[PDB]
Design an enzyme around this catalytic site. Sequence first.
Site, PDB file in Angstrom:
ATOM      1  N   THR B   1       0.789  -1.278   0.000  1.00  0.00           N
ATOM      2  CA  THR B   1       0.000   0.000   0.000  1.00  0.00           C
ATOM      3  C   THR B   1       0.807   1.308   0.000  1.00  0.00           C
ATOM      4  O   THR B   1       2.025   1.315   0.158  1.00  0.00           O
ATOM      5  CB  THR B   1      -0.853   0.120   1.280  1.00  0.00           C
ATOM      6  OG1 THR B   1      -1.587  -1.071   1.490  1.00  0.00           O
ATOM      7  CG2 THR B   1      -1.872   1.250   1.163  1.00  0.00           C
TER       8      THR B   1
HETATM    9  C1  LIG Z   1       0.062  -2.509   0.487  1.00  0.00           C
HETATM   10  C2  LIG Z   1      -0.857  -3.092  -0.619  1.00  0.00           C
HETATM   11  C3  LIG Z   1       1.103  -3.540   0.919  1.00  0.00           C
HETATM   12  O1  LIG Z   1       1.484  -4.325  -0.213  1.00  0.00           O
HETATM   13  C4  LIG Z   1      -0.788  -2.200   1.781  1.00  0.00           C
HETATM   14  O2  LIG Z   1       0.114  -1.924   2.869  1.00  0.00           O
HETATM   15  C5  LIG Z   1      -1.796  -3.280   2.245  1.00  0.00           C
HETATM   16  C6  LIG Z   1      -2.395  -2.795   3.553  1.00  0.00           C
HETATM   17  C7  LIG Z   1      -3.900  -3.123   3.657  1.00  0.00           C
HETATM   18  C8  LIG Z   1      -4.306  -2.873   5.099  1.00  0.00           C
HETATM   19  C9  LIG Z   1      -5.810  -2.980   5.249  1.00  0.00           C
HETATM   20  C10 LIG Z   1      -6.295  -4.326   4.768  1.00  0.00           C
HETATM   21  C11 LIG Z   1      -5.753  -4.637   3.373  1.00  0.00           C
HETATM   22  C12 LIG Z   1      -4.225  -4.540   3.329  1.00  0.00           C
HETATM   23  N1  LIG Z   1      -1.168  -4.557   2.590  1.00  0.00           N
HETATM   24  C13 LIG Z   1      -1.586  -5.730   2.094  1.00  0.00           C
HETATM   25  O3  LIG Z   1      -2.487  -5.869   1.270  1.00  0.00           O
HETATM   26  C14 LIG Z   1      -0.858  -6.941   2.645  1.00  0.00           C
HETATM   27  C15 LIG Z   1       0.559  -6.936   2.163  1.00  0.00           C
HETATM   28  C16 LIG Z   1       1.288  -7.871   3.126  1.00  0.00           C
HETATM   29  C17 LIG Z   1       1.912  -7.501   4.240  1.00  0.00           C
HETATM   30  N2  LIG Z   1       2.410  -8.613   4.786  1.00  0.00           N
HETATM   31  C18 LIG Z   1       2.082  -9.646   4.005  1.00  0.00           C
HETATM   32  C19 LIG Z   1       1.379  -9.179   2.969  1.00  0.00           C
HETATM   33  C20 LIG Z   1       0.911  -9.982   2.013  1.00  0.00           C
HETATM   34  C21 LIG Z   1       1.145 -11.348   2.068  1.00  0.00           C
HETATM   35  C22 LIG Z   1       1.876 -11.842   3.142  1.00  0.00           C
HETATM   36  C23 LIG Z   1       2.339 -10.949   4.111  1.00  0.00           C
HETATM   37  N3  LIG Z   1      -1.567  -8.134   2.172  1.00  0.00           N
HETATM   38  C24 LIG Z   1      -2.133  -8.995   3.030  1.00  0.00           C
HETATM   39  O4  LIG Z   1      -2.127  -8.866   4.255  1.00  0.00           O
HETATM   40  C25 LIG Z   1      -2.874 -10.155   2.379  1.00  0.00           C
HETATM   41  C26 LIG Z   1      -2.635 -11.453   3.158  1.00  0.00           C
HETATM   42  N4  LIG Z   1      -4.295  -9.816   2.438  1.00  0.00           N
HETATM   43  C27 LIG Z   1      -5.211 -10.457   1.690  1.00  0.00           C
HETATM   44  O5  LIG Z   1      -4.912 -11.362   0.910  1.00  0.00           O
HETATM   45  C28 LIG Z   1      -6.485 -10.049   1.851  1.00  0.00           C
HETATM   46  C29 LIG Z   1      -7.555 -10.528   1.223  1.00  0.00           C
HETATM   47  C30 LIG Z   1      -7.591 -11.655   0.182  1.00  0.00           C
HETATM   48  C31 LIG Z   1      -8.634  -9.880   1.637  1.00  0.00           C
HETATM   49  C32 LIG Z   1      -8.243  -8.970   2.540  1.00  0.00           C
HETATM   50  C33 LIG Z   1      -6.889  -9.025   2.717  1.00  0.00           C
HETATM   51  C34 LIG Z   1      -9.125  -8.166   3.129  1.00  0.00           C
HETATM   52  C35 LIG Z   1     -10.471  -8.257   2.818  1.00  0.00           C
HETATM   53  C36 LIG Z   1     -10.882  -9.196   1.886  1.00  0.00           C
HETATM   54  C37 LIG Z   1      -9.920 -10.008   1.302  1.00  0.00           C
END
Ligand SMILES: *[C@@]([C])([C][O])[C@](*)(=O)[C]([C][C]1[C][C][C][C][C]1)[N]C(=O)[C]([C]C1=[C][N]C2=C1[C]=[C][C]=[C]2)[N]C(=O)[C]([C])[N]C(=O)C1=C([C])C2=C([C]1)[C]=[C][C]=[C]2
Lengths: 222, 211, 235, 250, 244, 233, 231, 240
Positions: B1
């Site tokens: 993000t």
């Molecule tokens: C950027 C896009 C980072 O790349 C941003 O910082 C987001 C922050 C956001 C905070 C509020 C909720 C959504 C995320 N970070 C992510 O998207 C993280 C990136 C990340 C950090 N550590 C880590 C990451 C990814 C994979 C492994 C470890 N992404 C996630 O946390 C992933 C696991 N989230 C999902 O896949 C989600 C899905 C499918 C989903 C989510 C989150 C929320 C609602 C519906 C579906």
Amino acid sequence: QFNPYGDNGGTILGIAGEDFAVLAGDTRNITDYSINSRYEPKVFDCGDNIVMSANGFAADGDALVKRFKNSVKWYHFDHNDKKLSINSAARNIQHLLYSRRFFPYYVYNIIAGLDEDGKGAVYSFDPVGSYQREQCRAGGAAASLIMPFLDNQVNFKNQYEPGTNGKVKKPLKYLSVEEVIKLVRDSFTSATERHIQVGDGLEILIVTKDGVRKEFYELKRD
Amino acid sequence: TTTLAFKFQHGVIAAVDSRASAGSYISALRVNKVIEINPYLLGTMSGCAADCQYWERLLAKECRLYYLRNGERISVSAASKLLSNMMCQYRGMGLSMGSMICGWDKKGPGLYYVDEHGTRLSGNMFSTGSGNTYAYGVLDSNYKWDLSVEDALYLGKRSILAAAHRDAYSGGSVNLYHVTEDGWIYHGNHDVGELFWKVKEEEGSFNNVIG
Amino acid sequence: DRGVSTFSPEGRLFQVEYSLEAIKLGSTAIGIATKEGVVLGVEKRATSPLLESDSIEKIVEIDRHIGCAMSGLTADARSMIEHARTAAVTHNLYYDEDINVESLTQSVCDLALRFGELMSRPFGVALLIAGHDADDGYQLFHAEPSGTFYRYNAKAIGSGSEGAQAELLNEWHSSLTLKEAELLVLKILKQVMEEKLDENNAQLSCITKQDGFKIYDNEKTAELIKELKEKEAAE
Amino acid sequence: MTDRYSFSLTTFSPSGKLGQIDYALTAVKQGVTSLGIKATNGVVIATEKKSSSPLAMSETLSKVSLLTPDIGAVYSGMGPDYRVLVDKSRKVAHTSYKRIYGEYPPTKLLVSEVAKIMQEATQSGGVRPFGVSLLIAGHDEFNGFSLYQVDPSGSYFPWKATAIGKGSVAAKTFLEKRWNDELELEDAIHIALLTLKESVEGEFNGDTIELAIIGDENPDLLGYTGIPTDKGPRFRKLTSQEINDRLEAL
Amino acid sequence: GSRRYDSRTTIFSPEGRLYQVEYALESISHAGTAIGIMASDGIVLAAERKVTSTLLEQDTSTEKLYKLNDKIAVAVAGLTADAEILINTARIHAQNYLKTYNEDIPVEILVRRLSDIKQGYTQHGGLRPFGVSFIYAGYDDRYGYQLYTSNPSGNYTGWKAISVGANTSAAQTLLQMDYKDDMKVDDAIELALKTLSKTTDSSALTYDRLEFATIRKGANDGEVYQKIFKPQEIKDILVKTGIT
Amino acid sequence: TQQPIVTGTSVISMKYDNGVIIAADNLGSYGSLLRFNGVERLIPVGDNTVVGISGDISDMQHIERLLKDLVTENAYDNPLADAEEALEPSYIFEYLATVMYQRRSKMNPLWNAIIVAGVQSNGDQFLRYVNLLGVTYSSPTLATGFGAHMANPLLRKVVDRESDIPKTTVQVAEEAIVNAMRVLYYRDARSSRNFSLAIIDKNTGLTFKKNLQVENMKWDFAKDIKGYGTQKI
Amino acid sequence: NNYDGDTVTFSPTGRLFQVEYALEAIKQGSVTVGLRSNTHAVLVALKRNADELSSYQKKIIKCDEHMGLSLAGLAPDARVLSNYLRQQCNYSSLVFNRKLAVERAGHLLCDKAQKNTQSYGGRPYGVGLLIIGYDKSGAHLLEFQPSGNVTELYGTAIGARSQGAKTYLERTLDTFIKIDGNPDELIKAGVEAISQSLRDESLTVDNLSIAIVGKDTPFTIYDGEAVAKYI
Amino acid sequence: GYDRALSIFSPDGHIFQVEYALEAVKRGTCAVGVKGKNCVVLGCERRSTLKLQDTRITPSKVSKIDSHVVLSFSGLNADSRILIEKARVEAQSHRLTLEDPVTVEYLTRYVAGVQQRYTQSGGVRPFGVSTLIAGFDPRDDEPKLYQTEPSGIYSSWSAQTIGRNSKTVREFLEKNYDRKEPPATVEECVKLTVRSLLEVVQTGAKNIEITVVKPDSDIVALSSEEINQYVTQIEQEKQE
Ligand SMILES: *[C@@]([C])([C][O])[C@](*)(=O)[C]([C][C]1[C][C][C][C][C]1)[N]C(=O)[C]([C]C1=[C][N]C2=C1[C]=[C][C]=[C]2)[N]C(=O)[C]([C])[N]C(=O)C1=C([C])C2=C([C]1)[C]=[C][C]=[C]2
Ligand SMILES: [Mg+2]
């Protein structure tokens, strides 16, 4: 070394209509290159007009569904048989998932039903509890194959109105249950062709104000 | 993000993108990276999605209880510290959460940066996430305390756009918030795809890109 | 001596029965439920004129949709209120919704019998828990130290309770307005109070679906007292 | 189950008396006479072996007990209470001292530890005080020879000579006349036997009397040779024959 | 069950007194008198041993005066065994403070700690209180020479001169009469012994029935010396002041 | 976390029209050493259930005792222990499944793959699998270890889907199981010729067959095979 | 007298007075009736109000889809015991995929109540329970006393004036047991049974509480205008 | 552990242990609290039965809980130390977790909560102490004065007294203290506080302690001579 996790394959798909919702999933259960079962139900009726599916590691998926079903039961006991709204179920599941923040349920979870205004609702989770309300969501092994197709054929992404040449978008007209089921079946037929873990059978649960209905369709068994 | 937030004359601006990643796969096009803790408190999100949602929704529990006991709204300083103290309990455990706590209280507008290490920093401007470096470039060259609400809203909006373009793991959409002493105000969801072309034409920027 | 959790020959817990006597010594609290809202009112009863009466907090907010009035050993109520507030907010955390008034009351009453040889004695305070939810509408509960709770259309607790309850018996009907209920609480409080009722030694409050739980200003109550005096002098 | 007596069984009465301690001292008074005398070059402790039955082998019952190689103890009052105190005293000498400093504790400090145990039985929950008074004789390098009395309250006093139990009042008077600061150990043993004869009714011989001394180092009782600094225990229990020999010169 | 046999040591009387604390104070009133007198250049601690015997080994005996550290000492009145439990705790607290801050513990801080322990036995635990009253004589660089007393209630107060144990009413009157603020140690020594000589229940005050100690800056230059008097030294100061 | 020491290989099973069949060889292997030749790995529970276990034998013996204890405990204060309130295959399975998942969740698993075969009160066939991870699944044919790779393909030719179950007789089903056991003996290096077979029928009840042997084996063609390519003699 | 101070003390005649005093609390409580046939089991409970402004205290609690009880005595103790039953019914389902037998549910309640009668500090439960249910051996009715004694019966009643309803059922035994496949007639017999325990007051719409469980009937409670049919 | 329920209800609905704790407060030396327009004064009695006392080191009756809040008391002295210590710890704990000092109302609420807990916890007896807690909230010029008691109830007072002969000095304050116009200056506030104690104290020498607390952490204790001047002026006006 002992590895407590495993991958049972499978793929699930939830789509929210205007006054309905569907939660579909294939019936194939696998380990590595072997098939365990050609018909092992993955999408469940959890009561209160809510359907649920925990895709990924089956043991963790069966445990989560079992615990949520249990949570619905105790919600009735504790709060005078009140109906558990879909938004309340979603928040409850978040806390079930995060209870294991440091030993996660290796599952991608989706629930579907109707909101308190009668409109269709789908909620999608990650393994550690982050959730959100969505219109369209595919989860599991072939999630990356199906989601782009749904962006295109449900939300009309990258589609514009002829003659205008990119100036005017395609209007976001609502989809009927018959139209949605077509997109679901085509999604799983396509996923079965290009993904080895997807096949055998397709079970769809449709949710309306009248209740929960099931539909089953055969898939290729190779 | 990419997330940002900055103080100015007429309160604080908060802007975030809307993307979510699963490695290279874009798992979500439109996530909400801002939590409405109360009518005068906001919280941005970056890092592990589950950690951001759980701990900030838990912060909102603790902020509500403060109001009931003391019969008075919690300060931004106090709220930010409650959150940072939570992080220090799970210190070293592997939590991943970077957030700004935005709000208006007795001391005027307030803005605090909090992260998983227990860090807690007061400041006029912050930006977190994989695309913060891009956002800082726009912000640092255009920021003034003497900004109008209309111009400030645009600055944060434009700063996210900059990051959404260059950063692969930022994009989807932009969510704007403006915090006043009468509370926060949502200023809509803005698709980056449509916003990019709009800004390119009107501003003349992104000359390098063909449209 | 004798056990704290001992039954009397009549089949009653001694300590629970004795705590009820302490509640009879407490200042009067009255609650009236209507279809336009629930009204809660209390006697402050300052022990001296130098005591700043606005610091007497016998009406208390539990949530935006639930209020509470107390009578008896009011110090005992603080932990009950703390638990109630925690329960109300914790349920909002787990289920993303307002908690039912009955469920909140049940959670408070679960503490009541957690005493033995847990706390060393029952609570010496009774609570009137008033609120609103979407399922059962406007509700008024009476929570005792026995662990029992009854729902009421109208209820009075404290020293002037049986005199007030007889009055509420005659006055209450299912078509009462909020304004009528306010005056009715003031009327009955003025009847059972030792000192002359005014805006400083008595306090009003209400819970409506729109505005939620509100404690009334002394200026607002003063006008309702003046409106009461005139309507009683009208016949 | 669980020990639900977490409250004191010894409490102050309106007059300021601690009843259970007083009553414990009464139990000590009923007990058989024992005494201790300190000489210039040693200490002697003695008591009567009051046999409960002639069929009983009174040699198996030891009223005079070794606590450390240079410290001995004798009692008056309840025997079983004394027995467990000896066990605890022997252990505390190791745990709270020898395992720390690598040497045996001095008499006054071991007494202090025993006293502490007896004080705690006077204040702790769900217990009665010990029904004994101890006489602890001992030697250490920097304090020399010493003799201490320890009461049920946990109070302890150093003595030149004293007696406890049945005929203590008479015996203490007898000792006041005979004691001086120039007594040799043999003279103190002689006085101990004279004093003890007054309180004994029946047979008075080596088999009915228990007597031990803290005196010179006994290398013959050490059990090994080769270390010059280790010269043996100063505590020695006199035999039946050794007592009878001194009863002819009585 | 067990409730039947519980004395309930930590309760109020209808008058608002703590039974056991009051009865413990009654016990202490029968103990040997202990006196503390504070002067400008030092502090005196005097105390009377209870009806001794000729066969008691006095030179190795200690029932009244105890050393807590190099700067602080205490006079005891009550159960000796109880006092030793508290004394060893106080000795440890002083060493803990020294280890933590690398400075000798201020007198009051040590006193408050012991007094807080006594208080605890009057409010919780269901145990009997310690039947002990202390006189604390000490020095630190903040307040200089200090006298405190604590009793089984856990309440403590500061003094210029004070007595505990038997005949405190009589003793306190005599001290209040002859005490002056500009007084010195040698004068305070004389006052302490004269007061004991008049309040004693014994026929005459002799060396073998006394424990005596001084805390003096009468140590070579800016430092403090504790002097626990030997039997022969108590005998000499009795002749010097003209009592024997 | 541990490692399995003494191990048992494939357990195979299938449904037929009136009940279920289950089989497993009588070997306890110690790595490549074929150490113990008289091990029973099918364990009946009442007269309506057979639990087949593969994997660590010490953990099998532990499970065997849990089941034995389960029967004892069910009989306590139960007048209908041999009738309406008798142990069902579904009860026995869910108990084991609960244990297996709990143990994996404590990172101290029972190193096994289990198949519970039986017939319910209402005459329905029960056949379900569970393993050390707590993973569960059901199918017309089930098999563990090598059986999953070699037996299932053969058994699925008889009962490919649910609708083939009523069309399958006990003679056909047993024949298919016995053939599968022969194939496993040809191809599994940790298998033995001796095996046990159990049939749970809704009419004829529990038939438990011991000391069965693989027979009608084809080895004669080996005489003609010479060298590894070019050798003729 | 001297032997009623706590539950840990037998009297000289071998009686436990604290348990007997807890039994007394049940007799003060409002009447409730239980009865069953071979297909269904029914609870009928007379609810009690504090006054005219107050609600009528609920008497019947659901434990599972196939089991539930009615209470008489201290309501909070019924909440504690019903909560325990809910958990035990639930443990049986989650672990063994097995609906808890009504007989075994009684054995569990007996053992839970017993521990409170033999230990110091605690107290007996001050409530009586009537458990109905339908399991693999058909319909059942249990009577629970806080002494620990649990009894399986065709019909019964507990609470104030319960002797009248109990006599009626003892006469009607041969009739109501035969009411198979007819829920309304079985409830009628229960309503007519509880009517034998009424004095001065009669069965009104917010006074009466009924519950039923059976072969193809989940445990359901009827209150308000849902019981006007049976008045 | 010792679990015995010491504070229990009696047939007439009284908790005697809590009421007997109030009798201990009645025995304690008199304490008074008066709040002016821009200050609060805390007066305390010192019983003159104890002379030969070292007033430098003797525990003072008024205790600072923080730099802006003070606490005086009546009742058991040893009990008061436990409350003060707990309060002082909570004051630093609040600053540490919330980054603001405690409000006088919050600190009072905490101390009262402690007192309440000791009336329904097993194995413990109630605090034989009533407190007067005074001060000014951070960045606020409105004076604050609260009272607590063994039962755990608390309330705000324009002026209040506790301890022995508190009935008499409360009588004095009720007729002398005007709410519409409170002591405008520090002098007037101290004068009224000394006057009120002179109704009960005996000699106006070392028996009266005065502590003035002003806004923004401005706390000072008056000396003997300063107080003695108030004592002199009061009686000279009285001779008329
Ligand atoms: C950027 C896009 C980072 O790349 C941003 O910082 C987001 C922050 C956001 C905070 C509020 C909720 C959504 C995320 N970070 C992510 O998207 C993280 C990136 C990340 C950090 N550590 C880590 C990451 C990814 C994979 C492994 C470890 N992404 C996630 O946390 C992933 C696991 N989230 C999902 O896949 C989600 C899905 C499918 C989903 C989510 C989150 C929320 C609602 C519906 C579906
Ligand atoms: Mg294939």
